């Protein structure tokens, strides 16, 4: 049993290649990949429930930075804001959003941005999965701010539109303990992740 | 003010239209919808953290004192594979072949996990559970890699059917019953009653 906590974006963006390479190299180790908010991801690591966590930065501990990536806008196709090539902040600020629930970094990222802007954040509706995000935004009322790697399926959905912003960025990091890296399959997954 | 728990299939199937009618009818109400495995969805209902839950039937829902229970739909279990998976060749996949391939599965606390483990026990075939996962996005992401196949409820395959990199097939059945559950005290509260009403009159279709 190799147990992993990971940001929702990773199992439909870059992780599956790593999962496959690992299983090839350790055939008898069952993988467990639990998609979680960063904050919960660190709890369950501390509790010994996972061996490794891939989380954001709003939140003997070995950390490695993996990448940065912009935040973009998700929209119903033919939402007014889909008219822009790049969506200006003054327009975006006007429209109600779907948001992540508490314990997700992106949530604390979107709050922080709107605090600095001094524009009121209109949080119609809270969700906890990327599917829910797409399902809601499809319905045409609400828009969502989401990291680029979360929007892979979104870009190919003709019901939806994805747009860069006129920047707002997040960093994704990998996190474990030192004693854990003395375990070769864990170490191997750690190096696999960065290897590719 | 209104907190919903729901199995993953709902927010990519029948629930987003209900959310939309609900926010327009009660605009000052903050809606939270948390996608969860059935066990946790019920824990959080019992504990007052959500106001109602849509869950996979566990066969005991009416044993609770204050319970009201609405059956929404029954549905088949179907197979998910990569487009170019050998099993994609069939129109209706037979169990005798399907049993021979390593699977992605749900982890602990999902009704779908037991449904699948028990079936395999009952078939005297051994489940090869190479990977556990907890969302439909992960199921799709992993299955596009062409090693693993997945047993999923029909309504959990909406986006998979529109993805040319994936194949969805019926089996040659396994079914599940999705139900909505709350306590009778909560249905005295107007927005919970309204949400209850919207679901019963729209989630089935």
**Is the CATH number 3.40.190.10 carried by domain A2-66+171-195?**
yes
Please state which of the four CATH numbers 3.40.190.290, 3.40.50.150, 3.90.228.20, 3.20.20.70 is assigned to the domain occupying A67-170. Answer: 3.40.190.290
Residues from chain B contacting residue A11 (CB–CB below 8 Å): 133, 135, 137-138, 141-142
Q: Where are the domains of chain A?
A: 2-66+171-195, 67-170
Mutate to test the interface with A, among B37, B107, B137 (most CBs of A within 10 A): B137
Residue B23 has its nearest CB partner, among A101, A125, A131, at A125
Residues from chain A contacting residue B34 (CB–CB below 8 Å): 101, 127-128
B158 to A69, B24, B55: CA distances (angstroms) = 29, 26, 18
Helix (H, G, I), strand (E, B), or coil: what is residue A84? coil
Cα angle A155-B150-B114, degrees, rounded to a multiple of 5? 125
Nearest to B200 by CA among B71, B48, B104, B107: B71
B75-175 folds as: D-Maltodextrin-Binding Protein; domain 2 (3.40.190)
Compute the distance between CA of residue A1 and CA of residue A7 in angstroms, rounded to an integer.
20
DSSP 8-class letter at B88 = G
Residue B138 has its nearest CB partner, among A11, A30, A138, at A11
**Partners of residue A165 on adjacent β-strands:** A87
Pair type for strands B129-133 and B67-82: unpaired
Residues from chain A contacting residue B162 (CB–CB below 8 Å): 157
SS3 of chain A: helix, strand, coil, percent, to 5: 40, 30, 30
CB under 8 Å to A102, separation ≥6 — which residues?
A: A39
Phi, psi angles (nearest 5°) of residue A92 = -55, -40
Phi, psi angles (nearest 5°) of residue B126 = -95, 130
* Structure token pair of residue B20: 């939309």
Nearest to B13 by CA among B149, B142, B128, B153: B153
Pair type for strands B166-169 and B31-35: unpaired
Domain at B2-73+177-202, CATH class: alpha beta
Residue A193's CB is within 10 A of a number of other CB atoms, namely 22
Its sign, for the CA torsion B76, A128, A48, A68, is: positive
Compute the distance between CA of residue B44 and CA of residue B50 in angstroms, rounded to an integer.
6
Dihedral angle of Cα A100, A104, A109, A114, to the nearest 10 degrees: 40
Q: CA of B201 to nearest chain A CA: how many angstroms apart? A: 18
Number of H helices, E strands in chain B: 7, 9
| Contact yes or no for B131 and A8 at CB 8 A | no
Residue B6's CB is within 10 A of a number of other CB atoms, namely 25
Q: Is B153 exposed, middle or buried (0-12, 13-18, 19+ CB in 10 A)?
A: buried
Tokens 């986006």 label which residue? Answer: B159
B176 sits in which H/E element: strand B175-183
Helix (H, G, I), strand (E, B), or coil: what is residue B156? helix
| Contact yes or no for B134 and A31 at CB 8 A | no
Residue B61's CB is within 10 A of a number of other CB atoms, namely 17
**Partners of residue A146 on adjacent β-strands:** A72
Cβ–Cβ < 8 Å for B13, B158: yes
* Structure token pair of residue B191: 């927005």
Nearest to A103 by CA among B32, B39, B133, B180: B32
Residue B173's CB is within 10 A of a number of other CB atoms, namely 10
Helix (H, G, I), strand (E, B), or coil: what is residue B63? helix
Instruction: Name the method of structure determination.
Output: X-ray
């Amino acid at each position: 049993e190799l147990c992993i906590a990971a940001i929702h974006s990773l199992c439909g963006s870059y992780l599956p290649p790593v999962l496959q390479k690992f299983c090839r190299d350790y055939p008898e180790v069952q993988l467990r990949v639990t998609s979680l908010g960063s904050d919960r991801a660190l709890k369950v690591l501390k509790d010994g429930l996972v061996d490794l966590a891939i989380v954001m930065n709003n939140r003997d501990m070995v950390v490695e930075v993996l990448y940065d990536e912009p935040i973009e806008l998700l929209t119903a196709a033919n939402h007014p804001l889909a008219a822009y090539e790049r969506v200006p902040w003054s327009e975006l600020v006007r429209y109600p959003q779907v948001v992540f629930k508490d314990g997700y970094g992106m949530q604390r990222l979107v709050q922080e941005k709107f605090e600095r802007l001094e524009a009121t954040l209109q949080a119609a509706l809270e969700v906890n999965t990327l599917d829910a995000f797409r399902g809601v935004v499809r319905q045409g009322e609400l828009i969502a701010l989401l990291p680029s790697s979360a929007l892979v399926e979104a870009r190919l959905d003709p019901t939806l539109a994805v747009r860069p912003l006129a920047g707002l960025t997040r960093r994704v990091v990998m996190v474990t303990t030192q004693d854990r890296l003395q375990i070769p399959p864990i170490k191997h997954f750690w190096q696999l992740v960065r290897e590719n």
